[PDB]
Design a protein around this ligand. Structure first.
Ligand code: CLA
Ligand code: CLA
Ligand code: CLA
Ligand code: CLA
Ligand SMILES: C=Cc1c(C)c2cc3nc(c4c5[nH]c(cc6nc(cc1[nH]2)C(C)=C6CC)c(C)c5C(=O)[C@@H]4C(=O)OC)[C@@H](CCC(=O)OC/C=C(\C)CCC[C@H](C)CCC[C@H](C)CCCC(C)C)[C@@H]3C
Ligand SMILES: CC(C)=CCC/C(C)=C/CC/C(C)=C/CC/C(C)=C/CC/C(C)=C/CC/C(C)=C/CC/C(C)=C/CC/C(C)=C/CC/C(C)=C/CC1=CC(=O)C(C)=C(C)C1=O
Ligand SMILES: CCCCCCCCCCCCCCCCCC(=O)OC[C@H](CO[C@@H]1O[C@H](CO)[C@H](O)[C@H](O)[C@H]1O)OC(=O)CCCCCCCCCCCCCCCCC
Ligand SMILES: CCCCCCCCCCCCCCCCCC(=O)OC[C@H](CO[C@@H]1O[C@H](CO)[C@H](O)[C@H](O)[C@H]1O)OC(=O)CCCCCCCCCCCCCCCCC
Ligand SMILES: CCCCCCCCCCCCCCCC(=O)OC[C@H](COP(=O)(O)OC[C@@H](O)CO)OC(=O)CCCCCCCCCCCCCCC
Ligand SMILES: CCCCCCCCCCCCCCCC(=O)OC[C@H](COP(=O)(O)OC[C@@H](O)CO)OC(=O)CCCCCCCCCCCCCCC
Ligand SMILES: CC1=C(/C=C/C(C)=C\C=C/C(C)=C/C=C/C=C(C)/C=C/C=C(C)/C=C/C2=C(C)CCCC2(C)C)C(C)(C)CCC1
Ligand code: OEX
Ligand SMILES: [Cl-]
Ligand SMILES: [Fe+2]
Ligand code: NA
Lengths: 76, 31, 27, 30, 67, 145, 348, 336, 32, 30, 194, 38, 36
């Protein structure tokens, strides 16, 4: 029935988990370290917070053209 | 296996490990 | 008449006006 | 005419139907 | 034990004379589900029109609509 | 009373920032056409170049009871600015009904509040009644089975 | 059903598969609860980790920017967006995911999926109670968290200017929301909130008292020093002395419970009633119908420079919260208020 | 044992036949709490205005001086006094004692002694009834919280004026000022306490639902289903076998709470330990240990301050800070 | 002076449910 | 009156809890 | 008229309290008391559709009734007038007064059709047992569900304004204040005149 | 089913319920009278 | 089944979790979010 006590003790679990868990950890590490998190989720880099034109907190101030405007005042 | 228990356990476990590796990577990010 | 002046006319009193929140990309 | 928001909403209806069909297929499987 | 026999009661008696009568199988539940799905789609359309998430050519969705 | 229009000492039209709905009270500021603060009714009244008595703003009015009455020197300018942060300045009779002073709600607001409260209470009522009609056998008794 | 032939269809097979004992119960409600709840928790964990709030609020609320668990949050959209549902396909995002994250659409995603997950969860409670043939008092009790969630995350922002004034999904975000209700609504002075506070405090009191009383009337039921192993689920006798408990609390407090029925119904009743009263109060606050002031007190203090109360002190504190919080709280309002018009006390 | 004065007194005090048990802890609980009740009621009804901040600016707090139940409060002791033990005999007159805040000190001291002896009396009745004694240990958490807000926090801040006012609006005032100066929301012990009351309500609702749902038929849609048998039988009703199955099937059927004793121990221990934690959080913030301070923790590559929800909380906190005691500060840095 | 509206509301909210509950208790205790 | 109503309500609540403590129905079945 | 109706309904209530054991409420097949709830629902839906169609085709259109309140977009001039129905997408404009007669006509026709369908067609056994259609508590739960759905809808339209919520009757809107509706119109009029 | 109503029932209110109702009414009045008088 | 002790597995997972929490607390004093 595998009541979660025998599987954790068995080596069959840890043979296939000595690769999957470290590979996922390394995948997350590279996902952060390659800038892919910034590119995918749109968070600005520490050097990409203030553009030369605006030096204050950005404001969306529009609804139906919000996509075009956020493309305008984002970090290019 | 690939039963309901496997699917639920892995749907919890895999993104948590991915996010934990991501956060451990972000611990060494400096401005 | 002057849509630029009346937009600036209502600029100081109230920042939440529809006339401001629409077409704010061009400003 | 057919506004882009309406076209996107109809595509969203199609996508929601696809998701519901996928959930039905997954529960008919296993 | 005999109920109050009434003129209007025996007039309206057939409309209450088949309580518990049902159709075998699932009946028209498929057509019911189709109508419910169409109703949900229509409710989504009017909700998004009133939410201004569904812009239409003739719908202004503002107080000028009654101008 | 009319549209309270405010001018600087040298001459430029200032505007009182209107009160939003979230604020029970709001600071009285008069800002420029460009969007820069030029005067206010200050709390501290001992600093800067924004108090009314040193900026020198004047209120003109262009409406019914006040059509050409310009006030520049006294605290009536500050009073009219505070009234102008509430929108158009109107004359009110507070002695007929012995009026309170605090703003009341509209029938629209009362209707909406009563109906939303009743709507949640009836959500609970529907949940309870659906519970009772699906679970009639256990709400009455299952007889040791 | 009901002594009928009932030729089988696809529904009977689907019901048989869904209503089975597993590691996790699925049921029909699992067609909604499992995806909606998984997406809500995953979206919250993703927004707290990667999705920024620099565009909408002008602040950092994610782990990629330097925020803690108590600090990062899934922030609400901008006030200029209003009550837009903020679909990915909607007119705002226009099918662009990386800008949909930047536009605050993840908040709407998490909120709608959490609402439907709560719906699916209390449906699951109904389904499991029907499967085990028990009354759905768990669902009746869970109706109050659903009411609180609906009134707080839906009804209040729908009554206000937009989703921007809704609670952002986080910790410091919720603290901001709480302080905003203190400064702008005087939420402590609201009698419905007082009823909710009384309900929660009384429920915690009831939990502690009931647990301590049962654990201190546990009977012998064994010889070892650990009473936990003295319990047997097979036996048909009560594990604690209700008579002893009733006499103890009658001579300590004056009143005591005599019915386990009434005791546990009261334990169910107090927090549900408190949370429902607080939900009604938040509904009242959705339209700014707040119990902010006491007219007699304010007129008395207006005509008297001597009359002061703690309520007047609270009113003065709320004024400072509003004045010193609005400028950095609402960037849409563009409140560039100078420091001299902001109120100050002496020397601080 | 029957013809002796101290004997008859001892077996009257320790008697379990009293309507309310007195005991040797009750001989101290009853007079102090009756004194506190009398003085609190009389002060709440007709207390003259009292100068809380030591700046000759009294606040009313009493109904006959023009306020309601919500805004009426027995106001704390004067700041000029400090924690200098001001009873009636240390005053030259009752009017002076009332103007300086002596009723608050009297009620707080008597209330602290009364709740401590109430805990001792709970232990004493558990001992005299053959019970187990840890109901007093469970009660030690609200006593700790009351001590933290009425005694320990004034000790740490150096003045009984810092004590929580005996009222409702005064309680809110104490809350807001405490927020402004200690950032209680960002204090982990306070988060533990909030989680404790929320989980206490959660577990109370769960326990009530599971015990009220798991029944066999003994009460019908009428008052009672006694048709099977009337009162006077030991054939027990209820269930904890199907209730545990329902709770298991609710999530994953492995978090086993099949032991009723373990379940009730958890119900007892969780809000008690969390209220212990939040009371000690208040006691630590009495000595200005304060909450988390993440103001301007997030800076960019050039070093500009990126705003934060913690920064918004900071703005609200300093807005509270400039309002508190508008006239009681002469120097910039708030230390006393 | 005197808020007679508040007085009437408070007096009615006290009198009507208390009298209703007292009448129910009296008729319950009269017929066991 | 203002304070009289508050005093009356408070002493009414205190009288109710006093009657509940002392003149309660005697407990039956456990 | 409402007071006289209240008195007549009071008298009818007294008559139904006294005369409750009517043979109309008795099942002819078994002799026990029962209600044919699907048929009652069909009759009630037919009547509701007839009322909706009449209110939308005769009252609000002004062919027999007076119409409804139509006002200025800024609430200056308003009066009770007949309203021509709007059958296009503009009929789903919440602020279009023409969408109310069109809605009531179409919904009345559809309600009449559904009432005829429920009058003629019995429910299936599976659906009858699943929803407990033989019980009055189930229809109580469903009716309460529809009722607070409608309550949420009317509260939303009340708060956000609609054609059925005139400004001259219910006051202005908080969104009209926040969005500078009247202020913008006043400034536009002043600018056009100047 | 006959001249009397078979659904005839009586209402039962014991002293604990009377105390709870009176306490609820008086506590609600205590809480809300400060706001009704305002 | 029973090849590696369950207490040893739980102990190793406990050290990994404690080390991860230590890294998380150390990262609050360096890099982003370190207020410097
Ligand atoms: C949902 C239905 C509804 C709505 C939206 C309104 C709305 C309104 N009514 Mg009305 N009314 C209603 C039903 C409703 N009423 C009913 C059913 C009656 C018959 C009793 C009345 C009788 C009535 C009168 C006589 C008057 C109004 C008036 C008004 C207007 C003034 C605002 C107000 O009500 O005061 C404030 C509303 C409240 C404070 C609501 C109370 C909040 C909660 C529910 C109280 C909690 C009860 C508490 C537990 C009891 C303890 C208190 C106790 C100590 C006294 C307003 C637009 C006044 C008016 O303008 O004249 C035309 C007016 O004098 N109404
Ligand atoms: C049109 C809606 C509706 C209808 C027809 C019913 C009908 C019924 N309910 Mg129900 N209920 C509803 C809504 C409704 N409810 C809502 C919205 C809630 C949430 C608050 C509840 C919560 C509820 C519970 C918890 C229970 C019932 C019960 C019952 C059953 C009889 C008990 C009874 O009423 O005795 C008489 C009720 C009283 C004497 C109440 C005293 C008067 C109250 C305190 C104040 C009344 C306010 C005022 C006078 C009226 C204005 C309200 C109006 C504007 C909405 C009955 C069939 C009981 C049951 O399940 O049957 C066994 C039960 O315990 N209901
Ligand atoms: C199956 C569970 C489920 C449920 C209940 C939801 C529910 C929801 N999602 Mg979600 N989603 C899901 C799964 C689910 N989702 C999955 C698996 C994904 C990954 C692909 C997503 C990704 C996703 C995104 C990216 C977004 C949502 C959003 C939403 C919300 C609004 C959706 C909407 O407005 O369109 C409505 C959908 C429907 C009305 C369903 C259409 C049904 C059609 C009409 C059936 C017709 C077919 C017919 C039978 C064909 C035969 C006829 C033919 C022969 C002629 C909503 C509450 C949005 C949101 O969160 O708002 C901010 C959004 O942005 N979802
Ligand atoms: C001869 C019958 C009759 C007539 C002509 C009127 C006429 C009127 N009544 Mg009225 N009323 C009546 C009977 C009647 N009443 C009865 C019997 C009652 C007791 C229940 C009431 C109780 C009542 C109240 C409390 C009020 C009125 C009010 C009014 C006035 C305004 C109505 C209004 O605008 O609200 C709008 C009407 C509605 C919004 C009804 C909508 C119906 C919903 C949407 C049905 C939806 C569910 C439905 C089953 C779905 C069907 C499916 C579909 C496909 C068909 C108006 C003069 C108001 C007034 O001003 O006082 C004088 C007022 O507040 N009446
Ligand atoms: C802050 C307080 C609080 C929290 C966190 C909480 C949490 C929970 N309550 C549950 C249950 C309950 N709670 C109950 C009564 C109460 N609960 C209360 C207060 C709380 N209850 C109170 C005060 C009461 C008394 C009325 C009952 C009666 C039950 C149950 O029966 C139920 C249970 O079985 O317990 C184990 C659990 C199952 C819910 C679930 O999976 O939904 C499924 C739906 C999900 C997961 C999606 C919803 C997502 C949410 C609503 C929006 C997104 C939020 C993000 C995911 C996270 C944001 C976090 C930041 C805000 C910090 C869950 C752990
Ligand atoms: C001059 C004067 C008097 C000055 C005072 C002025 C002033 C400050 C007035 C106070 C105002 C006041 C009354 C405020 C309260 C107002 C307020 C917020 C009201 C809320 C009203 C309300 C309806 C709220 C809804 C939520 C709700 C229902 C809460 C109820 C809370 C409640 C009653 C909790 C229970 C409290 C309680 C002590 C529990 C009893 C526990 C107990 C004794 C168990 C005994 C016991 C345990 C066992 O385990 C077993 C086994 C047995 C056998 C057993 O027996
Ligand atoms: C309870 C049980 C059910 C639990 C959970 C169910 C969850 C449902 C989640 C979806 C609910 C609807 C979300 C979108 C609603 C919306 O966008 O509203 C906002 C939009 C209107 O949008 C507003 O319009 C105004 C017009 O002047 C302004 O222009 C505002 O700027 C604009 O935001 O309305 C709707 O789309 C639907 C309203 C009708 C239903 C509302 C129900 C709640 C009512 C609240 C009233 C105020 C308080
Ligand atoms: C509690 C409820 C839920 C907890 C689990 C959900 C949240 C998990 C994600 C948290 C996270 O990833 O943090 C991730 C953060 C990341 O840490 C941050 O990383 C940034 C990288 O740019 C910066 O370096 C920051 O300076 C750094 O602090 O770690 C922490 O916040 C440290 C604490 C870890 C979180 C503990 C939460 C639970 C704590 C106690 C629970 C006790 C009892 C619960 C009872 C109920
Ligand atoms: C953080 C600090 C942790 C302290 C926890 C305090 C424990 C009691 C608090 C609840 C109040 C009374 C509960 C009522 C109560 O006493 O519960 C019942 C239970 C009593 O069990 P026993 O009496 O069998 O165990 C105590 C010894 O006699 C063991 O033989 O208490 C415990 O489980 C103590 C174990 C806690 C282990 C450390 C945690
Ligand atoms: C020196 C002793 C120190 C303690 C004295 C103070 C204790 C006061 C007694 C508690 C109140 C009595 C509750 C009446 C209600 C009453 O007597 O009901 C009676 C009830 C007993 O119920 P039964 O077990 O008999 O239930 C079965 C019945 O349905 C059949 O008879 O008591 C309880 O519900 C348990 C205790 C709840 C007590 C809740 C506390 C409520 C707080 C009250 C605060 C008043 C407002 C503040 C004052 C302005
Ligand atoms: C977004 C989105 C989405 C969704 C997604 C999902 C649903 C997923 C996920 C996910 C997840 C789900 C993630 C996670 C995370 C997690 C974490 C990050 C964790 C942690 C941390 C910590 C710190 C911990 C600690 C602890 C505790 C407290 C418990 C036990 C012990 C330990 C130590 C472990 C999609 C794409 C659909 C699209 C739309 C949007
Ligand atoms: O007295 Mn009450 O309170 Ca402890 O801080 Mn410093 O001094 Mn006052 O200030 Mn904030
Ligand atoms: Cl203060
Ligand atoms: Fe129990
Ligand atoms: Na000061």
């Amino acid at each position: 029935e595998r009541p979660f006590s025998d599987i954790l003790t068995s080596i069959r679990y840890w043979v296939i988990h000595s690769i999957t868990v470290p590979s996922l950890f390394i995948a997350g590490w590279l996902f952060v370290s390659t800038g892919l998190a910034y590119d995918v989720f749109g968070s600005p880099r520490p050097n990409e917070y203030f553009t030369e034109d605006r030096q204050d907190a950005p404001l969306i101030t529009d609804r139906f053209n919000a996509l075009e405007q956020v493309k305008k005042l984002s970090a290019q | 296996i690939f039963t309901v228990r496997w699917l639920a356990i892995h749907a919890i476990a895999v993104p948590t490990i991915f996010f934990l590796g991501a956060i451990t990577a972000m611990q060494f990010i400096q401005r | 008449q002057r849509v630029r002046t009346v937009l600036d006319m209502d600029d100081p009193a109230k920042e939440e006006t529809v006339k401001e929140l629409r077409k704010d990309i061009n400003n | 005419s057919v506004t882009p928001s309406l076209k996107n909403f109809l595509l969203s209806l199609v996508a929601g139907a696809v998701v519901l069909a996928a959930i039905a297929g997954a529960v008919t499987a296993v | 034990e005999p109920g109050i026999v009434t003129p209007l009661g025996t007039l309206l008696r057939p409309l209450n004379s088949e309580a518990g009568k049902v159709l075998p199988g699932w009946g028209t539940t498929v057509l019911m589900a189709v109508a419910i799905l169409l109703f949900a789609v229509f409710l989504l359309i009017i909700l998004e029109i009133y939410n201004s998430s569904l812009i239409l050519d003739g719908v202004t969705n503002s107080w000028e609509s009654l101008a | 009373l009319g549209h309270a229009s405010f001018k600087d000492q040298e001459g430029r039209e200032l505007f009182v920032r209107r009160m939003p709905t979230f604020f029970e009270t709001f600071p009285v500021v008069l800002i420029d056409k460009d969007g820069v603060v030029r005067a206010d009714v200050p709390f501290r009244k001992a600093e800067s170049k924004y108090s009314i008595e040193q900026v020198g703003v004047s209120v003109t009015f262009y409406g019914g009871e006040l059509n050409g009455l310009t006030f520049t020197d006294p605290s009536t300018v500050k009073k009219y600015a505070r009234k102008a942060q509430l929108g158009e300045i109107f004359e009110f009779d507070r002695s007929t009904l012995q009026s309170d002073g605090v703003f009341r709600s509209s029938p629209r607001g009362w209707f909406t509040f009563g109906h939303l409260s009743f709507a949640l209470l009836f959500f609970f009522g529907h949940i309870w009644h659906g519970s009772r009609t699906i679970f009639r056998d256990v709400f009455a008794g299952i007889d040791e089975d | 059903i009901g002594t009928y032939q009932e030729k089988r269809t696809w529904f009977d097979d689907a019901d048989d598969w869904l209503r089975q004992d597993r590691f996790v119960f699925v049921g029909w409600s699992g067609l909604l609860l499992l995806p909606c709840a998984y997406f809500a928790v995953g979206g919250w964990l993703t927004g707290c980790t990667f999705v920024t709030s620099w565009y909408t609020h002008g602040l950092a609320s994610s782990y990629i920017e330097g925020c803690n668990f108590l600090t990062a949050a899934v922030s609400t959209p901008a006030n200029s967006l209003g009550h837009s549902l903020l679909f990915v396909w909607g007119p705002e995002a226009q099918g662009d995911l990386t800008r949909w994250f930047q536009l605050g659409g993840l908040w709407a995603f998490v909120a709608l999926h959490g609402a439907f997950g709560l719906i699916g969860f209390m449906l699951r409670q109904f389904e499991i109670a029907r499967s085990v043939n028990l009354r759905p008092y768990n669902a009746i009790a869970f109706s109050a968290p659903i009411a609180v969630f609906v009134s707080v995350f839906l009804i209040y922002p729908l009554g206000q200017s937009g989703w921007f004034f809704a609670p952002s999904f986080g910790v410091a975000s919720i603290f901001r929301f709480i302080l905003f209700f203190q400064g702008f609504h005087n939420w402590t002075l609201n009698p419905f909130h007082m009823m909710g506070v009384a309900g929660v405090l009384g429920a915690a009191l009831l939990c502690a008292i009931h647990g301590a009383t049962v654990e201190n009337t546990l009977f012998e039921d064994g010889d070892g020093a650990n009473t936990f192993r003295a319990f047997n689920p097979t036996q048909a006798e009560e594990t604690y002395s209700m008579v002893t408990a009733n006499r103890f609390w009658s001579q300590i407090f004056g009143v005591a419970f005599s019915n386990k029925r009434w005791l546990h119904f009261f334990m169910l009743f107090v927090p549900v009633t408190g949370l429902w009263m607080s939900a009604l109060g938040v509904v009242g606050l959705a339209l700014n119908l707040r119990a902010y002031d006491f007219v007699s007190q304010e007129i008395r203090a207006a005509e008297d420079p001597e009359f002061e109360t703690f309520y007047t002190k609270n009113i003065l504190l709320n004024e400072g919260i509003r004045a010193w919080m609005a400028a950095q709280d609402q960037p849409h309002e563009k409140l560039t208020l100078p420091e001299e018009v902001l109120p100050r006390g002496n020397a601080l | 044992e029957n013809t002796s004065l101290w004997a008859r007194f001892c077996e009257w005090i320790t008697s379990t036949e009293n309507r309310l048990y007195i005991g040797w802890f009750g001989v101290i609980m009853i007079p102090t709490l009756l004194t506190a009740i009398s003085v609190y009621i009389i002060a709440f009804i007709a207390a003259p205005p009292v100068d809380i901040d030591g700046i000759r600016e009294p606040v009313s707090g009493s109904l006959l001086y023009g306020n309601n139940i919500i805004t009426g409060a027995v106001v704390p002791t004067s700041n000029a006094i400090g924690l200098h033990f001001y009873p009636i005999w240390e005053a030259a007159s009752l009017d002076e004692w009332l103007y300086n805040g002596g009723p608050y000190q009297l009620v707080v001291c008597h209330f602290f002694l009364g709740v401590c002896c109430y805990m001792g009396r709970e232990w004493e009745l558990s001992y005299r009834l053959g019970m187990r004694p840890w109901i007093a240990v469970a009660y030690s958490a609200p006593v700790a919280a009351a001590t933290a807000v009425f005694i320990i926090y004034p000790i740490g801040q150096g003045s009984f004026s810092d004590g929580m006012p005996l009222g409702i609006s005064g309680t809110f005032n104490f809350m807001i000022v405490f927020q402004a100066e200690h950032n209680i929301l960002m204090h982990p012990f306070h988060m533990f306490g909030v989680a404790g009351v929320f989980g206490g309500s959660l577990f109370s609702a769960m326990h009530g639902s599971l015990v009220t749902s798991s029944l066999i038929r003994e009460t019908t849609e009428n008052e009672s289903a006694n048709a099977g048998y009337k009162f006077g039988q030991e054939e027990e009703t209820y269930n904890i076998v199907a209730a545990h199955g329902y709770f298991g099937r609710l999530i994953f059927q492995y978090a086993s709470f099949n032991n009723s004793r373990s379940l009730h121990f958890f119900l007892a221990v969780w809000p008690v330990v969390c209220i212990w934690l939040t009371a000690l959080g208040i006691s630590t913030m009495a000595f200005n240990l304060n909450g988390f301070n993440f103001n301007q923790s997030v800076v960019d590559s050039n070093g500009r301050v990126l705003n934060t929800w913690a920064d918004i909380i900071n703005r609200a906190n300093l807005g509270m800070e400039v309002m508190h005691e508008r006239n009681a500060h002469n120097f910039p840095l708030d230390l006393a | 002076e005197v808020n007679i509206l508040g007085l009437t509301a408070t007096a009615l909210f006290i009198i009507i449910p208390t009298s209703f509950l007292l009448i129910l208790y009296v008729k319950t205790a009269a017929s066991e | 009156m203002e304070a009289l109503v508050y005093t009356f309500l408070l002493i009414g609540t205190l009288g109710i809890i006093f009657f509940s403590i002392f003149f309660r129905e005697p407990p039956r079945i456990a | 008229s409402h007071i006289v109706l209240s008195g007549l309904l009071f008298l009818a209530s007294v008559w139904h309290w006294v005369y409750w054991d009517l043979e109309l409420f008795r099942d002819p097949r078994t002799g026990k008391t029962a209600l044919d709830l699907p048929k009652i629902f069909g009759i009630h839906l037919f009547l509701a559709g007839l009322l909706c169609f009449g209110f939308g085709a005769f009252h609000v259109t002004g062919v027999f009734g007076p119409g409804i309140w139509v006002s200025d977009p800024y609430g200056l001039t308003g009066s009770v007038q007949p309203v021509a129905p709007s059958w296009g997408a503009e009929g789903f404009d919440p602020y279009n007064p023409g969408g109310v007669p069109a809605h009531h006509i179409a919904a009345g026709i559809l309600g009449v059709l559904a009432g005829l369908f429920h009058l003629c067609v019995r429910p299936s056994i599976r659906l009858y047992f699943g929803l407990s259609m033989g019980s009055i508590e189930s229809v109580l739960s469903s009716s309460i569900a529809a009722v607070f759905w409608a309550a949420f809808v009317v509260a939303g339209t009340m708060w956000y304004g609609s054609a059925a919520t005139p400004i001259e009757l219910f006051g202005p809107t908080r969104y009209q204040w926040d969005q500078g509706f009247f202020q913008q119109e006043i400034q536009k009029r002043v600018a056009q005149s100047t | 089913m006959a001249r009397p109503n078979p659904n005839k029932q009586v209402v039962e209110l014991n002293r604990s319920s009377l105390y709870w109702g009176l306490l609820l009414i008086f506590v609600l009045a205590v809480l809300f009278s400060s706001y009704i008088f305002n | 089944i029973g090849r590696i002790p369950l207490w040893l597995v739980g102990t190793v997972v406990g050290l990994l979790a404690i080390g991860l929490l230590a890294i998380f607390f150390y990262g609050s004093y360096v890099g982003l979010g370190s207020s410097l």
